[PDB]
Amino acid sequence: SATSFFDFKVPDGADNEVDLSQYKGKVVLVVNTASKCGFTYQYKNLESVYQAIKKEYPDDFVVLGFPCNQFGSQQKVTFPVMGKINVNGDDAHPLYKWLKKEKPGLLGLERVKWNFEKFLIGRDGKVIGRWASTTEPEKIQDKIIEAIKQPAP
Amino acid sequence: ATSFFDFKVPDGADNEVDLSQYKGKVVLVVNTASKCGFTYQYKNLESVYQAIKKEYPDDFVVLGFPCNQFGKVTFPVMGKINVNGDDAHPLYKWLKKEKPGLLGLERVKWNFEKFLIGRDGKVIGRWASTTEPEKIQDKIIEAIKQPAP
């Protein structure tokens, strides 16, 4: 809908508002992280893909983690981790309402199923990829690097 | 003791399958849809299977049992069986009374109810069709770190 990812604003951890246009023209991987601890091997893998591509392409690529408490039933990272948000429901942060419409999940299902679904933002700000929690960040790596070799508009 | 691993079941070609061939492994049992057009649940399950499969290759088996009583993956799919009634396969008669449903109700209510078997062959968990496979990974990986009897 002619909107671009870099049109959005989000809260960082300190509940201060971050403007996503500060990342304009970069490749962004958006991931909803667990509010609760105990997912060390997925933080490790996302920290690992982020160190890798940081070496090859410094400043080309940012990972934004967004904590989410919505996936629980009744591990150090260096990429920016943001304020806590809802990814689902009518209360979902406007950013995630856009991400979900722009790139529906499997069979068109728009809801995020679990923690650690990933969206890939190209330099132009369109969603170029969505991967389930079961996909390993290392399989996005070649899609990231293709987004990086692409010029911004 | 009667263990999950004592049972035989029919495979797709209705050959005898002995569950003993999986003895000492962690097994998730899911009654699958008969008719076509339930693709969300198959791909979702396969997706959790390929995951655990890469973390712990060979520890974890998903077993799908088609069932017509209600209304492409890599894990084994078995012969068609009845899950409820007097006509239920012995394995589901067993699984049901071992791990009853929400308020003691033992029948399977819809497609894709999931039973988790520990390395000791006893049922450690039961989830209905409303629960996502991604929510089960915790209890599967916990059972995999557990040693067999």
Side-chain angles (χ1 to χ4, degrees), chain A residues 36 69-74 114, chain B residues 102 127 130-132 135 138-139:
Chain A
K36 173 147 122 168
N69 65 342
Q70 284 182 331
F71 304 98
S73 192
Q74 322 74 342
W114 194 237
Chain B
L102 224 47
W127 299 262
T130 83
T131 289
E132 280 285 72
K135 298 193 29 172
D138 57 16
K139 267 244 178 294

PDB file of all heavy atoms in Angstrom, chain A residues 36 69-74 114, chain B residues 102 127 130-132 135 138-139:
ATOM      1  N   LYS A  36      10.123 -14.257  27.905  1.00  0.00           N
ATOM      2  CA  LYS A  36      10.782 -15.168  28.837  1.00  0.00           C
ATOM      3  C   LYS A  36      12.122 -15.656  28.288  1.00  0.00           C
ATOM      4  O   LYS A  36      12.303 -15.822  27.078  1.00  0.00           O
ATOM      5  CB  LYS A  36       9.880 -16.374  29.134  1.00  0.00           C
ATOM      6  CG  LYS A  36      10.532 -17.498  29.964  1.00  0.00           C
ATOM      7  CD  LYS A  36       9.543 -18.212  30.893  1.00  0.00           C
ATOM      8  CE  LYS A  36       9.483 -19.709  30.607  1.00  0.00           C
ATOM      9  NZ  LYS A  36       8.749 -20.448  31.666  1.00  0.00           N
ATOM     10  N   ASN A  69       5.335 -11.225  24.722  1.00  0.00           N
ATOM     11  CA  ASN A  69       4.862 -12.115  25.768  1.00  0.00           C
ATOM     12  C   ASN A  69       3.705 -12.990  25.311  1.00  0.00           C
ATOM     13  O   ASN A  69       3.215 -13.803  26.100  1.00  0.00           O
ATOM     14  CB  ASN A  69       4.427 -11.296  26.985  1.00  0.00           C
ATOM     15  CG  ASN A  69       3.220 -10.409  26.688  1.00  0.00           C
ATOM     16  OD1 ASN A  69       2.900 -10.142  25.519  1.00  0.00           O
ATOM     17  ND2 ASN A  69       2.545  -9.940  27.748  1.00  0.00           N
ATOM     18  N   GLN A  70       3.269 -12.856  24.061  1.00  0.00           N
ATOM     19  CA  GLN A  70       2.039 -13.478  23.593  1.00  0.00           C
ATOM     20  C   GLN A  70       2.158 -14.969  23.320  1.00  0.00           C
ATOM     21  O   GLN A  70       1.163 -15.565  22.917  1.00  0.00           O
ATOM     22  CB  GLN A  70       1.540 -12.793  22.316  1.00  0.00           C
ATOM     23  CG  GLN A  70       0.878 -11.442  22.518  1.00  0.00           C
ATOM     24  CD  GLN A  70       0.353 -10.825  21.210  1.00  0.00           C
ATOM     25  OE1 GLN A  70       0.887 -11.075  20.130  1.00  0.00           O
ATOM     26  NE2 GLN A  70      -0.687 -10.011  21.313  1.00  0.00           N
ATOM     27  N   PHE A  71       3.310 -15.612  23.510  1.00  0.00           N
ATOM     28  CA  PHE A  71       3.451 -17.035  23.158  1.00  0.00           C
ATOM     29  C   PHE A  71       3.929 -17.834  24.379  1.00  0.00           C
ATOM     30  O   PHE A  71       5.019 -18.413  24.386  1.00  0.00           O
ATOM     31  CB  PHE A  71       4.393 -17.222  21.948  1.00  0.00           C
ATOM     32  CG  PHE A  71       3.970 -16.445  20.728  1.00  0.00           C
ATOM     33  CD1 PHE A  71       4.554 -15.211  20.432  1.00  0.00           C
ATOM     34  CD2 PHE A  71       2.978 -16.929  19.886  1.00  0.00           C
ATOM     35  CE1 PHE A  71       4.159 -14.475  19.327  1.00  0.00           C
ATOM     36  CE2 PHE A  71       2.581 -16.194  18.769  1.00  0.00           C
ATOM     37  CZ  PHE A  71       3.179 -14.965  18.496  1.00  0.00           C
ATOM     38  N   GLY A  72       3.094 -17.877  25.416  1.00  0.00           N
ATOM     39  CA  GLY A  72       3.320 -18.732  26.578  1.00  0.00           C
ATOM     40  C   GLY A  72       2.021 -19.293  27.136  1.00  0.00           C
ATOM     41  O   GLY A  72       1.046 -18.547  27.299  1.00  0.00           O
ATOM     42  N   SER A  73       1.988 -20.588  27.452  1.00  0.00           N
ATOM     43  CA  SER A  73       0.742 -21.268  27.778  1.00  0.00           C
ATOM     44  C   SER A  73       0.602 -21.528  29.279  1.00  0.00           C
ATOM     45  O   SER A  73       1.548 -21.948  29.956  1.00  0.00           O
ATOM     46  CB  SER A  73       0.619 -22.580  26.998  1.00  0.00           C
ATOM     47  OG  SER A  73      -0.702 -23.083  27.100  1.00  0.00           O
ATOM     48  N   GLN A  74      -0.600 -21.254  29.780  1.00  0.00           N
ATOM     49  CA  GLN A  74      -1.010 -21.377  31.175  1.00  0.00           C
ATOM     50  C   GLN A  74      -1.011 -22.836  31.632  1.00  0.00           C
ATOM     51  O   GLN A  74      -2.049 -23.394  32.006  1.00  0.00           O
ATOM     52  CB  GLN A  74      -2.411 -20.763  31.345  1.00  0.00           C
ATOM     53  CG  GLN A  74      -2.664 -19.482  30.512  1.00  0.00           C
ATOM     54  CD  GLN A  74      -2.872 -19.721  28.996  1.00  0.00           C
ATOM     55  OE1 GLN A  74      -2.526 -20.782  28.453  1.00  0.00           O
ATOM     56  NE2 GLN A  74      -3.422 -18.715  28.311  1.00  0.00           N
ATOM     57  N   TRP A 114       4.431 -18.236  16.390  1.00  0.00           N
ATOM     58  CA  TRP A 114       5.250 -18.529  17.555  1.00  0.00           C
ATOM     59  C   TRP A 114       6.307 -17.437  17.697  1.00  0.00           C
ATOM     60  O   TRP A 114       6.392 -16.515  16.874  1.00  0.00           O
ATOM     61  CB  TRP A 114       5.852 -19.928  17.410  1.00  0.00           C
ATOM     62  CG  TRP A 114       6.456 -20.514  18.653  1.00  0.00           C
ATOM     63  CD1 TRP A 114       7.747 -20.959  18.814  1.00  0.00           C
ATOM     64  CD2 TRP A 114       5.799 -20.733  19.908  1.00  0.00           C
ATOM     65  NE1 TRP A 114       7.927 -21.441  20.096  1.00  0.00           N
ATOM     66  CE2 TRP A 114       6.751 -21.306  20.789  1.00  0.00           C
ATOM     67  CE3 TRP A 114       4.506 -20.484  20.382  1.00  0.00           C
ATOM     68  CZ2 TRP A 114       6.443 -21.636  22.112  1.00  0.00           C
ATOM     69  CZ3 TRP A 114       4.206 -20.797  21.703  1.00  0.00           C
ATOM     70  CH2 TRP A 114       5.166 -21.379  22.548  1.00  0.00           C
TER      71      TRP A 114
ATOM     72  N   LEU B 102      -9.340 -33.551  28.550  1.00  0.00           N
ATOM     73  CA  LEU B 102      -9.302 -32.389  29.433  1.00  0.00           C
ATOM     74  C   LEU B 102      -9.940 -32.687  30.785  1.00  0.00           C
ATOM     75  O   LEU B 102      -9.344 -32.425  31.841  1.00  0.00           O
ATOM     76  CB  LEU B 102      -9.978 -31.200  28.748  1.00  0.00           C
ATOM     77  CG  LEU B 102      -9.236 -29.871  28.870  1.00  0.00           C
ATOM     78  CD1 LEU B 102      -7.729 -30.015  28.562  1.00  0.00           C
ATOM     79  CD2 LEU B 102      -9.893 -28.859  27.931  1.00  0.00           C
ATOM     80  N   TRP B 127      -2.085 -33.302  23.514  1.00  0.00           N
ATOM     81  CA  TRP B 127      -2.572 -31.978  23.146  1.00  0.00           C
ATOM     82  C   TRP B 127      -3.645 -32.136  22.087  1.00  0.00           C
ATOM     83  O   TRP B 127      -3.592 -33.065  21.277  1.00  0.00           O
ATOM     84  CB  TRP B 127      -1.452 -31.068  22.599  1.00  0.00           C
ATOM     85  CG  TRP B 127      -0.361 -30.816  23.582  1.00  0.00           C
ATOM     86  CD1 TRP B 127      -0.221 -29.724  24.380  1.00  0.00           C
ATOM     87  CD2 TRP B 127       0.743 -31.684  23.892  1.00  0.00           C
ATOM     88  NE1 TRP B 127       0.888 -29.854  25.174  1.00  0.00           N
ATOM     89  CE2 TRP B 127       1.498 -31.051  24.898  1.00  0.00           C
ATOM     90  CE3 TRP B 127       1.161 -32.938  23.420  1.00  0.00           C
ATOM     91  CZ2 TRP B 127       2.656 -31.622  25.437  1.00  0.00           C
ATOM     92  CZ3 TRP B 127       2.314 -33.507  23.957  1.00  0.00           C
ATOM     93  CH2 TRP B 127       3.048 -32.847  24.949  1.00  0.00           C
ATOM     94  N   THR B 130      -6.119 -27.710  18.666  1.00  0.00           N
ATOM     95  CA  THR B 130      -5.934 -26.268  18.836  1.00  0.00           C
ATOM     96  C   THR B 130      -4.513 -25.881  19.246  1.00  0.00           C
ATOM     97  O   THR B 130      -4.160 -24.699  19.157  1.00  0.00           O
ATOM     98  CB  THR B 130      -6.923 -25.714  19.883  1.00  0.00           C
ATOM     99  OG1 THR B 130      -6.395 -25.909  21.198  1.00  0.00           O
ATOM    100  CG2 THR B 130      -8.288 -26.409  19.801  1.00  0.00           C
ATOM    101  N   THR B 131      -3.693 -26.821  19.700  1.00  0.00           N
ATOM    102  CA  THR B 131      -2.348 -26.503  20.157  1.00  0.00           C
ATOM    103  C   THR B 131      -1.364 -26.593  18.999  1.00  0.00           C
ATOM    104  O   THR B 131      -1.406 -27.542  18.213  1.00  0.00           O
ATOM    105  CB  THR B 131      -1.939 -27.449  21.281  1.00  0.00           C
ATOM    106  OG1 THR B 131      -2.685 -27.118  22.451  1.00  0.00           O
ATOM    107  CG2 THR B 131      -0.462 -27.332  21.582  1.00  0.00           C
ATOM    108  N   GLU B 132      -0.482 -25.592  18.892  1.00  0.00           N
ATOM    109  CA  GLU B 132       0.490 -25.551  17.808  1.00  0.00           C
ATOM    110  C   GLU B 132       1.649 -26.502  18.098  1.00  0.00           C
ATOM    111  O   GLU B 132       2.133 -26.563  19.232  1.00  0.00           O
ATOM    112  CB  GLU B 132       1.025 -24.135  17.617  1.00  0.00           C
ATOM    113  CG  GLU B 132       0.093 -23.229  16.842  1.00  0.00           C
ATOM    114  CD  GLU B 132       0.083 -23.535  15.347  1.00  0.00           C
ATOM    115  OE1 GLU B 132      -0.473 -24.583  14.955  1.00  0.00           O
ATOM    116  OE2 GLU B 132       0.636 -22.729  14.562  1.00  0.00           O
ATOM    117  N   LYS B 135       4.656 -25.201  20.069  1.00  0.00           N
ATOM    118  CA  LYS B 135       4.513 -25.196  21.517  1.00  0.00           C
ATOM    119  C   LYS B 135       4.941 -26.503  22.171  1.00  0.00           C
ATOM    120  O   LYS B 135       5.071 -26.547  23.399  1.00  0.00           O
ATOM    121  CB  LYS B 135       3.065 -24.955  21.866  1.00  0.00           C
ATOM    122  CG  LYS B 135       2.549 -23.652  21.395  1.00  0.00           C
ATOM    123  CD  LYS B 135       1.217 -23.381  22.073  1.00  0.00           C
ATOM    124  CE  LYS B 135       1.118 -24.031  23.469  1.00  0.00           C
ATOM    125  NZ  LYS B 135      -0.114 -23.562  24.121  1.00  0.00           N
ATOM    126  N   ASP B 138       9.418 -27.751  23.444  1.00  0.00           N
ATOM    127  CA  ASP B 138       9.985 -27.785  24.793  1.00  0.00           C
ATOM    128  C   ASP B 138       9.943 -29.187  25.388  1.00  0.00           C
ATOM    129  O   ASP B 138      10.976 -29.730  25.797  1.00  0.00           O
ATOM    130  CB  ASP B 138       9.247 -26.796  25.706  1.00  0.00           C
ATOM    131  CG  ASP B 138       7.714 -27.056  25.784  1.00  0.00           C
ATOM    132  OD1 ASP B 138       7.218 -28.147  25.393  1.00  0.00           O
ATOM    133  OD2 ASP B 138       6.990 -26.142  26.234  1.00  0.00           O
ATOM    134  N   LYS B 139       8.748 -29.777  25.449  1.00  0.00           N
ATOM    135  CA  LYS B 139       8.553 -31.086  26.059  1.00  0.00           C
ATOM    136  C   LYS B 139       9.178 -32.214  25.239  1.00  0.00           C
ATOM    137  O   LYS B 139       9.488 -33.282  25.791  1.00  0.00           O
ATOM    138  CB  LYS B 139       7.065 -31.345  26.249  1.00  0.00           C
ATOM    139  CG  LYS B 139       6.550 -30.944  27.610  1.00  0.00           C
ATOM    140  CD  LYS B 139       6.042 -32.172  28.385  1.00  0.00           C
ATOM    141  CE  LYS B 139       5.558 -31.782  29.773  1.00  0.00           C
ATOM    142  NZ  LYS B 139       6.689 -31.305  30.627  1.00  0.00           N
TER     143      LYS B 139
END
